[PDB]
């Protein structure tokens, strides 16, 4: 294997480099913006409108969150390669957790003409002892993939979240009529840096970490994640999580 | 409502200046560098130009040169908004047709005062 | 050039250090942002009701933290540009005298942590005018000075890092001289490589990622100059930086 | 010259609050956690304490409890400044002897008003 093991590790290193290169340049933009807006407010104290003062500060905050997002992308990668990712379990109502997650990606789905739908197969006070942030992140990664990898010119594009109870834990299904995943890459999608060979004709951007961090979180919960997709009809992502 | 051409290679500055302008009642057209400014000059004639100096492809001085050369571009009021410390640059700008040279960071009160000054 | 096994163990060693770098800088970058966020939010919600002096100070902190984050971002950017071999340079006429004096003040705290006296000497009266990138040459000096403290003798009576600045017709020669542990002959060229660290009995306690000199070499050569080391194990080390005139 | 103790693990918060207090003309003493806070209480008696809840080593609820017990300490006014915005956390702090619970982000004008109200009493 050694002859190919070098070839494999050498391939990973190229992608690791490209990721750091991209994220470094991305972090520069919000910072520049924060600096400019701060130095402008500072240089012009007591001389500007409350309305202007308000807007300029909102920009400082938006950019701070964007910078935080990117810094989290980097830290998530760091904790993944180091296998240092952790979880904090607490009682959360999953019905409103997925509902809050749906409402967060609604604006992004509208931009790509995609309907966001949440369906519950059981009464809605579904509670489990799980990490609320990290499972929300799992939900958002899957929802984002459903909007990003939808059909190009199709009449009724959707992403649907189906919440149920299987065996003894909780089962979440993220369904989409979208492009579907070819059967050769069915296992490869959860790997680090991996994207579909097509890349949707290179139109869609992505680091390929999404599903790798998702899997890791799901498994740290003592659960498993799998996919069922037809080559050109759509995709169903399956997440099962225990309860204490 | 008047139309202003905002020329600067820094995106935050454009966003910052446009907001101030739009809050008053002016329409804003943006240009990421000197040449794109000339490219959008062929499309229409603006009432004012807010020009940066240091830009890629074409810097501010060159824009000023080619502004004073053409039939229609020569009579558009230009306000330079630059981060240049040296005031030798200010002389070089004012001579090339700049109706005012303001330093960065920009003060929305001082700026809006000058815009009204050149449009009335 | 090398066997497949050795090419593998090298790469794996580089990965560990890349991994350790990224992990560290991720955490370092978080601190300024927390401050930035806290201050931004505090201002925004007390918008109409802040004292002007308090608003002024709250903005200063945001600007200072923005600058600290910017510095930390440049460390990561350099790391990225180094493995892409594409670094930039911005030359301007600066005084080299106070430029090193800036770096001497920037390290006196860390130098005292190890009982190391920072010295600066010059063969020709200040100012020594040079057409060099002031941020980058300061970084070069810091890197060398940092190494002189980091790799000094663990228990020695008189530790020192000296910066010798001697002017010539062709350009300027900077010598950073330490009486530290010194460098073995086999690793004399190797030290300027990316992620290379000397693995010894004395240099095992010390922390590092092995970028300092790799970056330093690149900056120096981009100035069209030369950099080399001269040392003797147990005596100390001399790093030479040559920056020519245009 | 009134002296205030500032207890919070977050360094930006301390700097933020300290400045507002000093600008009002008070001496500020800082503590990174609950244990350090109590350590400094042996040296001197503060006129006011500003207290966080979530901290390493020792938390605010513990601090409050220990303050309410000791004879010299239990008369000192405590303002709680915390990210914990639940009604339960507020009540708990209140029964534990807190004069007021304030939710983050820090809001200086309201903070100054309460600091004055307590010290001039
Ligand atoms: N809902 C989906 N439909 C079709 N393809 C998908 C879907 N979700 C993921 N994929 C494919 O699997 C790859 C891995 O997913 P992910 O780790 O999120 O990568 P990225 O971050 O680039 O989207 C994607 O590049 C995409 O090609
Ligand atoms: N003054 C010095 N004395 C002895 N060895 C040195 C000195 N400076 C650098 N070195 C050697 O060069 C190697 C790489 O240095 P550098 O590139 O600065 O990275 P780091 O200092 O983080 O290891 C070190 O492992 C060290 O052995
Ligand atoms: Cl954390
Ligand atoms: Mg994704
Ligand atoms: Mg510019
Ligand atoms: Mg070093
Ligand atoms: Mg805290």
mmCIF file of N, CA, C and O in Angstrom, chain C residues 6 24 82 94 109 121 144 190 193 209:
data_model
loop_
_atom_site.group_PDB
_atom_site.id
_atom_site.type_symbol
_atom_site.label_atom_id
_atom_site.label_comp_id
_atom_site.label_asym_id
_atom_site.label_seq_id
_atom_site.Cartn_x
_atom_site.Cartn_y
_atom_site.Cartn_z
ATOM 1 N N UNK C 6 11.147 7.432 2.963
ATOM 2 C CA UNK C 6 11.636 8.673 3.555
ATOM 3 C C UNK C 6 10.793 9.867 3.106
ATOM 4 O O UNK C 6 10.568 10.801 3.880
ATOM 5 N N UNK C 24 -3.143 26.315 16.546
ATOM 6 C CA UNK C 24 -2.737 27.437 17.388
ATOM 7 C C UNK C 24 -3.305 28.760 16.909
ATOM 8 O O UNK C 24 -3.937 29.489 17.678
ATOM 9 N N UNK C 82 3.641 30.965 1.554
ATOM 10 C CA UNK C 82 4.922 30.256 1.584
ATOM 11 C C UNK C 82 4.840 28.921 0.849
ATOM 12 O O UNK C 82 5.694 28.618 0.015
ATOM 13 N N UNK C 94 13.602 53.783 4.085
ATOM 14 C CA UNK C 94 13.452 53.823 5.542
ATOM 15 C C UNK C 94 14.798 53.806 6.261
ATOM 16 O O UNK C 94 15.801 53.345 5.715
ATOM 17 N N UNK C 109 11.194 41.962 26.441
ATOM 18 C CA UNK C 109 10.374 41.236 27.404
ATOM 19 C C UNK C 109 10.637 39.736 27.314
ATOM 20 O O UNK C 109 10.944 39.097 28.321
ATOM 21 N N UNK C 121 24.568 47.147 17.701
ATOM 22 C CA UNK C 121 25.811 47.829 17.368
ATOM 23 C C UNK C 121 25.782 48.289 15.909
ATOM 24 O O UNK C 121 25.134 47.663 15.069
ATOM 25 N N UNK C 144 14.948 36.337 13.616
ATOM 26 C CA UNK C 144 16.322 36.030 13.999
ATOM 27 C C UNK C 144 16.546 36.257 15.489
ATOM 28 O O UNK C 144 17.104 35.396 16.174
ATOM 29 N N UNK C 190 19.906 23.123 5.751
ATOM 30 C CA UNK C 190 18.558 22.619 5.998
ATOM 31 C C UNK C 190 17.652 23.554 6.802
ATOM 32 O O UNK C 190 16.433 23.499 6.659
ATOM 33 N N UNK C 193 14.860 25.613 5.120
ATOM 34 C CA UNK C 193 13.761 24.885 4.491
ATOM 35 C C UNK C 193 12.465 25.051 5.280
ATOM 36 O O UNK C 193 12.492 25.308 6.491
ATOM 37 N N UNK C 209 7.567 25.570 14.812
ATOM 38 C CA UNK C 209 6.911 24.988 13.643
ATOM 39 C C UNK C 209 7.852 24.980 12.440
ATOM 40 O O UNK C 209 7.577 24.325 11.433
#
